[PDB]
Amino acid sequence: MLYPKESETREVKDLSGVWEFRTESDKNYILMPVPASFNDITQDINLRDYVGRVYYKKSFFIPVYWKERNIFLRVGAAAHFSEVYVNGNLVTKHKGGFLPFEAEISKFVNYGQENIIEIMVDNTLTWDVLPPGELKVIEDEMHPKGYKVLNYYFDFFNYSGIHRPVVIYTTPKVYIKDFSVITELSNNSALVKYSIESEGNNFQVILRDKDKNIVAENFGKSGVLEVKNPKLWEPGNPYLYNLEIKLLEKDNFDIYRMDIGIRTVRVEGKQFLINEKPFYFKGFGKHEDSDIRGKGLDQVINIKDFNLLKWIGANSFRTSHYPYSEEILFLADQYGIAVIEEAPAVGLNLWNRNEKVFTEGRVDGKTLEHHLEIMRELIARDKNHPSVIMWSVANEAATYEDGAEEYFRRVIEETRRLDPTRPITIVENTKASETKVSKYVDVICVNRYYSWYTDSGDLSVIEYQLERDLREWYELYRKPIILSEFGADAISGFHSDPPLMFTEEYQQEMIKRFVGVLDRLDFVVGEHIWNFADFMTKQSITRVVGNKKGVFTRNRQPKMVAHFLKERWSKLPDFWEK
């Protein structure tokens, strides 16, 4: 499914705005913005911590002239289970809170009249949705009848609601359903190879440069476009060409356009190559999180975040720990930021080797089935973005378990089959010698928190422990390694010398000592600090109103270590043969 875009042949109507909202088995509505998480909008603590079904409702008018058009209703994201009703008719259901879903609804609309859309969203986690969790009953001596808790083991808050825009769009009855683009370098040219999915068959395809000059054209539902003297897309030079696809049939006419970038990505030895040059990742793990709206899409915050990425000198980030909005990937295309996009397989770990995760009752064949469908949906959505340069299949799963090996072999095999054009990783906090899964990926991503979660407060252990660990990863697997997470919680304004945990000084010193180690290791091709910004988590005595490891505050202002990273990364080239 293609991102909804207006053209000569397609209308788009955005239903974002103020909706009516209620919780299960309640008749009274309140007002609720869309897109947004509902948790922080009100002062009702029982809604903040609500677990169950909520219902959104809105009126909309369909123009009579949309008859004899396809009418699609698209929901960008709703966490985690959703059902969509048009005038009381169920038009689609969806499982998974971080990818879009849509249905054709012309059969159910009142033309030239009022219509009602209702969207049910259920935030109840189970062990066969990603990320997983479990609702548990607690009726003991200290809890009243009916006390229940939603348990989950990922470290970000279970925000719920409609997190990305709801839109209605039209197409002709015979229309461009999808297309695939692959770019190759050939002699002094680039090739853009394409295939179009449609019931139609007569297509003209045109490629235009930045100045609207036509640089290539082809008649054909599949084909190759040759670009002589191409300008390649890469961090530091985000050149985009505009691909125009025109269906020209007897009764149907359809146009779809997308900006694409010409680049190659390849792993060879201990090098991560973009356009055949050795890349060095400088960046962050991020989160879709901001004040008040929770996980809701906000283009103000998105553009602010990319300007901060360019300001600090980052060239990349990982979409920890789930696919982000398409909007963020289009921006990464424009700004020239390399993206590792990650499936929502986070929380597959009970920090305890006595509780097994990959076992009947928890992560099983049903979870695997969902994970495989997720990879198919994710690659289908994002396969044409130049900014996505790697897929991450999971974050900190219990990869030391025997059952994790067969599980992830299947996930990894399916991902590569779906997209052979990008490398694959998995983000590990398991010990190097214990993971049964990292031997199957292209690039190793390791999260390490020496002197924070272990030997807390003792910065002196970092060089000893980190160098020994990373050398063992390389000795066992002989793959490029990204230090995919490291950092320390810092309360803005907490200062100390000597540095103490939770101060800005400790965060900067820890990060500084980690990267001094990486500079001595020629097989380390990247550093991603956790996290870009402070974000909300569930409440616990270990979380000082959320996770405070941001390099920026939640309102997008820098802590001390942001300036250290700006100075370091201004000296580090994007392409660096270590």
Q: Which residues bind its own copies (CB under 8 A)?
A: 6-8, 11, 13-14, 17-18, 31-33, 36, 40-43, 60-61, 63, 65, 112-114, 291-293, 296, 298-301, 303-304, 307-308, 310-311, 331, 334, 554-556
For its own copies, the closer of residues 312 and 389 by Cβ is 312
Nearest approach, Cβ of residue 251 and its own copies (Å):
16
Nearest approach, Cβ of residue 25 and its own copies (Å):
20
Closest CA to 131 of 328, 406, 356, 371: 371
How far is the C-alpha of 290 from the C-alpha of 555, rounded, in Å?
7
Catalytic one of 396, 428, 504, 509: 396
For its own copies, the closer of residues 108 and 335 by Cβ is 335
Q: Give, as one character, the DSSP assignment of residue 10.
A: B
The kind and range of the H/E element at 179 are: strand 178-186
Nearest approach, Cβ of residue 92 and its own copies (Å):
23
Q: Give, as one character, the DSSP assignment of residue 522.
A: T
The kind and range of the H/E element at 425 are: strand 424-428
* Angle ∠(421,423,427) on CA atoms, nearest 5: 150
* Main-chain phi, psi angles of 46, to 5 degrees: -75, -20
Catalytic one of 326, 485, 505, 527: 485
For its own copies, the closer of residues 73 and 267 by Cβ is 73
Question: What's the longest Cα–Cα distance across the chain?
Answer: 77
For its own copies, the closer of residues 460 and 555 by Cβ is 555
How far is the C-alpha of 391 from the C-alpha of 419, rounded, in Å?
9
Q: Give the 3-state DSSP-derived string for 220-280, with helices as H, strands as E and coil as C.
A: CCEEEEEEECCCCEECCEECCEEEEEEEECCCCEEEEEEEECCCCEEEECCEEEECCEEEC
Which residues, 6 or more positions from 211, have their beta carbon under 8 angstroms from its beta carbon?
A: none
For its own copies, the closer of residues 18 and 461 by Cβ is 18
Neighbours of 299 (CB within 10 A): 11
How much of the chain is helix, strand and coil, in % rounded to 5?
20, 35, 45
Buried/exposed code over 428-445 (b: 16+ C-beta within 10 A; e: otherwise): bbbebeebbbbebbbbbb
For its own copies, the closer of residues 124 and 334 by Cβ is 334
For its own copies, the closer of residues 46 and 188 by Cβ is 46
Which residues, 6 or more positions from 249, have their beta carbon under 8 angstroms from its beta carbon?
A: 174, 200, 201, 202
Q: Would you say the C-alpha torsion 497, 500, 506, 509 has a positive or negative sign?
A: positive
- 238 CA to centre of own chain: 20
Nearest approach, Cβ of residue 73 and its own copies (Å):
16
Closest CA to 308 of 512, 518, 559: 559
Nearest approach, Cβ of residue 302 and its own copies (Å):
8
Q: Counting beta carbons within 10 angstroms of the beta carbon of residue 544, is it exposed (0 to 12), middle (13 to 18) or buried (19 or more)?
A: middle
Peptide bond just before 499 cis, omega within 30 deg: no
- 305 CA to centre of own chain: 15
For its own copies, the closer of residues 456 and 557 by Cβ is 557
For its own copies, the closer of residues 14 and 139 by Cβ is 14
β-pair type (524-530, 281-285):
parallel
396 is an active site residue: yes
Per the listing, tokens 């900067």 go with 508
* Angle ∠(136,139,142) on CA atoms, nearest 5: 120
Nearest approach, Cβ of residue 15 and its own copies (Å):
10
Amino acid at 171: T
For its own copies, the closer of residues 152 and 159 by Cβ is 159
The residues annotated with a catalytic role in the active site are 396, 485
